[PDB]
């Protein structure tokens, strides 16, 4: 029963770590998306630098 509790605890650790990796994937994706707004804002600013009237 102690050995069985240890294996059930290892199963529960694996389930917990799998859910943790899922949450960390979801969060990494949110950051990647906001980072692509930052990248696109850099691109938009680079286009604005070619508008010599507004850029002046």
């Amino acid at each position: 029963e102690k050995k069985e509790k240890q294996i059930e605890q290892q199963k529960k650790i694996q389930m917990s770590n799998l859910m943790n990796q899922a949450r960390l994937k979801v969060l990494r994706a949110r950051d990647d998306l906001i980072t692509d707004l930052l990248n696109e804002a850099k691109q938009r600013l680079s286009k604005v630098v070619k508008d010599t009237t507004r850029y002046q």
């Binding site: 050995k3 069985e4 294996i7 059930e8």
Partner: protein
């Protein structure tokens, strides 16, 4: 009389048989702790197979 002699010999054999039976059955009662191991090891093996199936 030969009748009481023969009767006392049968009565003596009877007393010996029950006294020897007591000693035999007392020795058999001591074996219970040694014979118990055959079931104890089967319970270990049953829990071990169940544990492997849970893994």
């Amino acid at each position: 009389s030969q009748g009481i002699q023969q009767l006392l010999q049968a009565e003596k054999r009877a007393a010996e048989k029950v006294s020897e039976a007591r000693k035999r059955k007392n020795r058999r009662l001591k074996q219970a702790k040694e014979e118990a191991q055959a079931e104890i090891e089967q319970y270990r093996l049953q829990r071990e197979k169940e544990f492997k199936a849970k893994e």
